[PDB]
Ligand binder design. Structure first.
Ligand SMILES: Nc1ccn([C@@H]2O[C@H](COP(=O)(O)O)[C@@H](O)[C@H]2O)c(=O)n1
Ligand SMILES: Nc1ccn([C@@H]2O[C@H](COP(=O)(O)O)[C@@H](O)[C@H]2O)c(=O)n1
Ligand SMILES: [Mn+2]
Ligand SMILES: [Mn+2]
Ligand SMILES: [Zn+2]
Ligand SMILES: [Zn+2]
Length: 295
């Protein structure tokens, strides 16, 4: 878990390095994936030109940064297609919608065996609280693993937030861009250890796989997606949650949707609080301090 965050990045920008990277990823059970794309003038939904594809698997302690721009999409696809198409190797994503659209549109490939960890988290929230909101990476790492992320380089982040320039076109890439690019795939693989193969997780992995497959089918159609699967960008389709995860949950104490019994203020505020000694759990009439004859 802690070891994954210390994986160094290896830039893959030659045919020789690509063949070696493929060989490693071919022996994996799970591969975390992400993309860095050109920032657009529109700042649109559809990702710009693919610059990097980031990969980090369980087979080797390393983050591959595939320079798709240098290699070209044709070279990258020829060596990575069957790997991406192999359903026996799980492809991990954190919000896969735009990435899947980009892989379909720009690279001509639809990945198989996809698991979307953002959707996984929302599916847990649906099961327990009838909440269909998508949460950011920082929130999910905190909530699931207890970690607080460092946060990205601010000059890198400001350049992306401005969106007046491609940013990821420039070669060679400076180290603080390469480190920024490598960050999310480390976090994704780390999250999979907490969410996948864990009996305390109240949703089955196969159910989230099938829910993720609906996203992949919707977003990998060989062309730009006009109609979104979700009502707003920061939520998950409720009918899809109903179908693949089941009914939404709620508080077992007060009956309300939006929180669990462990978070319930009505439960905690409703407990007996001793007016004489202040302790929760008994009243003053049953207090041993106030009434030592009881002890
Ligand atoms: N405009 C938006 C707003 C949110 N989102 C998604 O919803 C998540 C939660 O965003 P908020 O932090 O705004 O709640 C983001 O991490 C992102 O995946 C999006 O993709 N587009
Ligand atoms: N943690 C929480 C959150 C909400 N609640 C209660 O649940 C009810 C409905 O919650 P919302 O206000 O989120 O809709 C309210 O009566 C609120 O006080 C609670 O008792 N504990
Ligand atoms: Mn992404
Ligand atoms: Mn990223
Ligand atoms: Zn409650
Ligand atoms: Zn007392």
């Amino acid at each position: 878990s802690s070891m994954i965050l210390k994986y160094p990045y290896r830039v893959v920008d030659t045919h020789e390095k690509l063949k070696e990277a493929v060989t490693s990823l071919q022996g994996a059970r799970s591969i975390a994936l992400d993309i860095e794309a050109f920032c657009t003038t529109d700042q649109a939904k559809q990702l710009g030109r693919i610059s990097l594809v980031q990969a980090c698997s369980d087979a080797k302690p390393v983050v591959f940064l595939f320079d798709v721009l240098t290699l070209t999409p044709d070279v990258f696809v020829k060596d990575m297609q069957s790997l991406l198409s192999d359903r026996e190797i799980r492809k991990l994503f954190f919000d896969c919608r735009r990435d899947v659209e980009a892989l379909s549109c720009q690279l001509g490939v639809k990945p198989e065996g996809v698991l979307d960890l953002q959707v996984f988290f929302t599916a847990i929230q649906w099961k327990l609280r009838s909440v269909n909101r998508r949460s950011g990476m920082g929130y999910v790492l905190k909530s699931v693993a207890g970690l607080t992320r460092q946060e990205g380089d601010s000059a890198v982040q400001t350049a992306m937030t401005l969106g007046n320039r491609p940013v990821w076109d420039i070669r060679p890439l400076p180290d603080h861009f390469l480190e920024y690019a490598a960050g999310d795939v480390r976090h994704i693989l780390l999250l999979s250890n907490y969410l996948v193969g864990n009996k305390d997780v109240p949703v089955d992995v196969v159910a989230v796989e099938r829910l993720t497959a609906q996203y992949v089918e919707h977003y990998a159609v060989g062309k730009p997606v006009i109609t979104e699967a979700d009502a707003t960008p920061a939520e998950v389709n409720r009918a899809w949650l109903e179908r693949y995860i089941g009914p939404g949950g709620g508080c077992h104490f007060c009956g309300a949707k939006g929180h669990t019994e462990a978070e319930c203020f009505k439960k905690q505020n409703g407990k007996a609080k001793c007016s004489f000694c202040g302790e929760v759990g008994h009243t003053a009439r049953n207090c041993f301090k106030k009434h030592p004859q009881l002890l």
